[PDB]
Design a binder for this molecule. Structure first.
Ligand SMILES: [Zn+2]
Length: 42
């Protein structure tokens, strides 16, 4: 939640309100909102 959108908004996050100029990128970010699945860490 911080104002600072650069470049064209090709893919925006319909959860927090972020923007990504790469479909894949956006998907990688949305992971924070959803439950991921990987190795144990932290
Ligand atoms: Zn988001």
């Amino acid at each position: 939640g911080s104002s600072g959108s650069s470049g064209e908004k090709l893919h925006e996050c319909n959860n927090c309100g972020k923007a990504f100029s790469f479909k894949s990128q956006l998907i990688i970010h949305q992971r924070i909102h959803t439950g991921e699945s990987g190795p144990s860490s932290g």
